[PDB]
Design an enzyme around this catalytic site. Structure first.
Site, PDB file in Angstrom:
ATOM      1  CG  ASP A 141     -23.167   9.056 -15.454  1.00 57.25           C
ATOM      2  OD1 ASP A 141     -22.899   8.442 -14.417  1.00 57.25           O
ATOM      3  OD2 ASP A 141     -24.330   9.413 -15.747  1.00 57.25           O
ATOM      4  CD  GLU A 148      -2.813  -0.597  -0.334  1.00 58.83           C
ATOM      5  OE1 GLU A 148      -2.928  -1.829  -0.173  1.00 58.83           O
ATOM      6  OE2 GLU A 148      -3.035  -0.035  -1.424  1.00 58.83           O
ATOM      7  CG  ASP A 170      -0.894   4.749  -1.027  1.00 59.27           C
ATOM      8  OD1 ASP A 170      -1.025   4.670   0.206  1.00 59.27           O
ATOM      9  OD2 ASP A 170      -1.694   4.209  -1.813  1.00 59.27           O
ATOM     10  CB  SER A 184      -5.087   2.168  -1.335  1.00 56.15           C
ATOM     11  OG  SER A 184      -3.936   2.859  -0.865  1.00 56.15           O
ATOM     12  N   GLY A 214     -25.953   4.196 -11.801  1.00 57.11           N
ATOM     13  CA  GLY A 214     -26.998   4.583 -12.726  1.00 57.11           C
ATOM     14  C   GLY A 214     -26.672   5.953 -13.277  1.00 57.11           C
TER      15      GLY A 214
HETATM   16 CA   LIG Z   1     -23.446   7.338 -12.387  1.00 61.16          CA
END
Ligand SMILES: [Ca+2]
Length: 357
Positions: A316, A78, A82, A278, A334
């Site tokens: 989106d 991790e 990072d 992360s 959605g």
């Molecule tokens: Ca969405």
């Protein structure tokens, strides 16, 4: 089906990070509560990607120091993930890694030390997941939230991973839980997706959900923080927990986190693949560093602004869910903001254009 992997540069390219900017003049603080990193892996890695290696320095908090255990499957994974993701994408920035004991006070102290640091002066702070918000002592939530409020007042951006165990966040108490610090309204909560992309286009981007065994992005509705005024038009749904109730929706944005389409990294000398939310906080910390460089002034607290920008600024995500506990599909992605991916993945150049005066 076939597992893949990307270098951080591939992912930045897919999200159209602004070109010609590398975070010069910025400092990104990274909070760590264990493990460490070695200069060998970092040098090999940055050299391999063809970027000029950023300066990376360690800061000791409450006696803790940079102590890699040497196990590529341990905490070093991790820590190095990072630094490698942030450093590879904002190589002009200075990276300051704050090590603290694995206690509530150590975590708090690392954050405040970074935010108020007059020597390293970070403009951005990147944090990994910290645990279901309702598993935290109330006094710790309050202290941490105030530290984030202070960072916002000071113009420091704070990003946090939303979690890797779906909408239940690792708890088996028959309830859904969001993770903290991601749940704080003053933190830019970072969720995860499965990204299928090439240099010139995104072929597909869905909610990261590999089941109980492989993990899934955190996301949901806070039971502690009220719905922020700036998030009231995002259409955050009521909590799925009986009793429902409105609350701060998690996450705010999302990016590639699926280990099956993970990040190629070098940990303790070993070239391998790692995923998880992360990776997303440092990924976007690098984007903010480039934007800050261009604007000439830190963007600081971004949440209110993000939610009022035109939706063309984001990609989106509309398909998938982050339920790894049952068949209810809570929560589901959605059109528009959702509790799996927030506003979606940012389109770097459009976000920068929208923030330019
Ligand atoms: Ca969405």
């Amino acid at each position: 089906a076939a597992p893949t992997a990307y270098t951080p540069l591939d992912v930045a390219q897919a999200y159209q990070f602004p070109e010609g900017l590398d975070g010069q003049g910025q400092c990104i603080a990274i909070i760590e509560l264990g493990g460490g990193y070695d200069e060998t892996s970092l040098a090999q890695y940055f050299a391999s990607l063809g970027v000029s290696a950023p300066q990376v320095v360690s800061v000791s908090v409450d006696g803790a120091t940079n102590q890699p255990t040497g196990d590529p499957n341990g905490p070093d994974g991790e820590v190095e993930l990072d630094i490698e993701v942030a450093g590879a994408l904002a190589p002009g920035a200075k990276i300051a890694v704050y090590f603290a004991p694995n206690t509530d006070a150590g975590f708090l102290n690392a954050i405040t030390t970074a935010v108020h640091d007059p020597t390293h002066k970070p403009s951005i702070v990147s944090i990994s997941a910290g645990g279901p918000e309702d598993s935290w002592a109330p006094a710790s939530i309050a202290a941490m939230n105030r530290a984030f409020l202070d960072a916002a007042a000071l113009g420091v951006t704070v990003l946090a991973a939303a979690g890797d165990s779906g909408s239940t966040d690792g708890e088996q108490d028959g309830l859904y839980h969001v993770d903290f610090p991601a749940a704080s309204p003053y933190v830019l909560a970072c969720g995860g997706t499965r990204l299928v992309a090439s240099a010139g286009r995104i072929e597909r981007e869905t909610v990261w959900n590999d089941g109980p065994d492989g993990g899934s992005t955190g996301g949901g509705v806070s039971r502690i923080f009220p719905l922020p005024s700036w998030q009231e038009r995002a259409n955050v749904p009521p909590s799925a927990n009986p009793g429902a109730g409105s609350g701060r929706g998690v996450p705010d944005v999302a990016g590639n986190a699926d280990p099956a389409t993970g990040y190629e990294v070098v940990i303790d000398g070993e070239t391998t693949v790692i995923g998880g939310t992360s990776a997303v906080a440092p990924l976007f910390a690098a984007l903010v560093a480039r934007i800050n460089q261009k604007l000439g002034k830190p963007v600081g607290y971004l949440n209110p602004t993000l939610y009022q920008l035109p939706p063309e600024v984001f990609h989106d995500i509309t398909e998938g869910n982050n339920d790894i506990a049952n068949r209810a599909r809570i929560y589901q992605a959605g059109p528009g903001w959702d509790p799996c991916t927030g506003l979606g993945s940012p389109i770097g150049i459009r976000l920068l254009q929208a923030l330019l005066p």
